[PDB]
Protein backbone atom coordinates (compact mmCIF):
# COMPACT_ATOMS: atom_id res chain seq x y z
CA UNK A 1 0.00 0.00 0.00
CA UNK A 2 2.85 2.35 0.93
CA UNK A 3 4.61 1.52 -2.31
CA UNK A 4 1.51 2.18 -4.42
CA UNK A 5 0.90 5.68 -3.14
CA UNK A 6 4.50 6.88 -3.16
CA UNK A 7 5.59 5.03 -6.31
CA UNK A 8 2.32 4.38 -8.08
CA UNK A 9 2.39 1.24 -10.16
CA UNK A 10 6.10 1.52 -11.08
CA UNK A 11 7.70 -0.47 -8.19
CA UNK A 12 6.26 -3.94 -9.01
CA UNK A 13 8.02 -3.68 -12.38
CA UNK A 14 11.39 -2.56 -11.02
CA UNK A 15 13.09 -0.23 -8.53
CA UNK A 16 10.55 2.33 -7.26
CA UNK A 17 10.52 5.89 -8.61
CA UNK A 18 8.88 8.69 -6.60
CA UNK A 19 6.06 10.53 -8.41
CA UNK A 20 3.35 12.91 -7.08
CA UNK A 21 0.16 11.06 -6.17
CA UNK A 22 -1.99 13.58 -8.06
CA UNK A 23 0.14 13.05 -11.14
CA UNK A 24 -0.02 9.29 -10.52
CA UNK A 25 -3.81 9.37 -10.51
CA UNK A 26 -3.79 11.32 -13.79
CA UNK A 27 -1.72 8.65 -15.48
CA UNK A 28 -4.26 6.00 -14.43
CA UNK A 29 -7.11 8.16 -15.78
CA UNK A 30 -5.47 8.28 -19.22
CA UNK A 31 -5.65 4.47 -19.14
CA UNK A 32 -9.44 4.80 -18.91
CA UNK A 33 -9.47 7.27 -21.82
CA UNK A 34 -10.11 10.54 -19.94
CA UNK A 35 -7.57 13.34 -20.51
CA UNK A 36 -5.54 14.75 -17.64
CA UNK A 37 -7.25 18.12 -17.57
CA UNK A 38 -10.31 16.29 -16.25
CA UNK A 39 -8.54 14.91 -13.16
CA UNK A 40 -6.79 18.17 -12.24
CA UNK A 41 -9.83 20.43 -12.82
CA UNK A 42 -12.02 18.13 -10.70
CA UNK A 43 -9.16 17.32 -8.28
CA UNK A 44 -10.78 19.07 -5.31
CA UNK A 45 -14.02 17.18 -5.83
CA UNK A 46 -12.32 13.82 -6.42
CA UNK A 47 -10.50 13.98 -3.06
CA UNK A 48 -13.81 14.54 -1.28
CA UNK A 49 -15.46 11.64 -3.12
Amino acid sequence: LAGTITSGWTFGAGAALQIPFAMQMAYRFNGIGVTQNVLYENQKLIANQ
Binding site: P20, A22, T35, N37, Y40, E41, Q43
Partner: peptide
Protein backbone atom coordinates in the same frame (compact mmCIF):
# COMPACT_ATOMS: atom_id res chain seq x y z
CA UNK B 1 -4.30 23.49 -23.69
CA UNK B 2 -7.57 22.96 -21.88
CA UNK B 3 -8.48 25.59 -19.31
CA UNK B 4 -7.59 28.56 -17.19
CA UNK B 5 -4.35 28.76 -15.28
CA UNK B 6 -6.07 29.42 -11.91
CA UNK B 7 -7.99 26.08 -11.79
CA UNK B 8 -4.99 23.69 -11.76
CA UNK B 9 -2.85 23.28 -8.62
CA UNK B 10 0.96 23.48 -8.59
CA UNK B 11 1.17 24.85 -12.14
CA UNK B 12 4.42 26.77 -12.73
CA UNK B 13 4.84 29.89 -14.83
CA UNK B 14 6.93 29.04 -17.90
CA UNK B 15 7.27 29.84 -21.59
CA UNK B 16 6.00 27.48 -24.29
CA UNK B 17 7.67 27.73 -27.67
CA UNK B 18 5.89 27.47 -31.01
CA UNK B 19 7.95 26.31 -34.05
CA UNK B 20 5.56 27.93 -36.57
CA UNK B 21 5.88 31.59 -35.50
CA UNK B 22 9.63 31.90 -36.33
CA UNK B 23 9.17 30.58 -39.87
CA UNK B 24 6.23 32.92 -40.47
CA UNK B 25 8.29 35.93 -39.39
Amino acid sequence: VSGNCDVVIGIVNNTVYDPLQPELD
